[model samples]
Target: KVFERCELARTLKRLGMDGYRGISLANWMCLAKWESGYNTRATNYNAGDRSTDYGIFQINSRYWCNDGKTPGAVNACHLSCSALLQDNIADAVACAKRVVRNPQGIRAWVAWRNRCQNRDVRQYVQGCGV
Candidate 1:
């Protein structure tokens, strides 16, 4: 599913992600836009390690969730990687929050590091009334 930006902002806010848990909603919005273009079914395969990043947040199977094909995965989210690809973002949000708690914090997402970090992303949530 592809979500309108405003709708996604509202959803994220409802999930307590509007600057909750040490992550700004603007940063999350920017990351999701770059990672998945707001598509729920997005997936990217990493040939370097044969791992896959799943969903809007692009949670990695190598360390975050198990895709079954990824051997020796840590599955930190304790759920299937495919679970992040659903229209319902509850699991994805929960998993992403868990990922943020890691030492790297939101920097764990390369997209965030490159596009969101040290940048003014308040425009991402503008007019969303979050």
Candidate 2:
């Protein structure tokens, strides 16, 4: 379980986010449970399209993997999944943190999730400490 444990913590830390950083460790762990069950090889298909989103975080092909704006019929688009899965937790955490840090705010995590709350993905993969 070292992969799961280390990667999980590493992913969170890379973003400068911790249970103490306005996010709940329990909630973050919940997301890890749902997305990968702490497995690096986890993957899922988008119901809207057959395209794949890989790793524990389920990063979509359209944005991270695929060069095309839309899903492709070929497996060529699946390349990034392997790289991301090699260290899925790190990759996912980095991406997530990058999203928050871009605007540079203590509440950036909350803001990001709130903006996306109306969408399918629930806001706050974990609880906001505030």
In TM-score terms, which candidate is top? 1
Looking at model 1, residue 30 earns an lDDT score of 95
TM-score of each: 0.96, 0.51
Q: RMSDs, each prediction? A: 0.9, 7.8
- Residue pairs with backbone atoms closer than 3 Å in model 2 (clashes): none
Tens digit per residue, CA lDDT, model 2, 61-99: 655555244554433334445665765355556554443
Candidate 1 stretches greater than 4 Å from native = none
Candidate 1, which ten residues in sequence have the lowest lDDT sum? 18-27
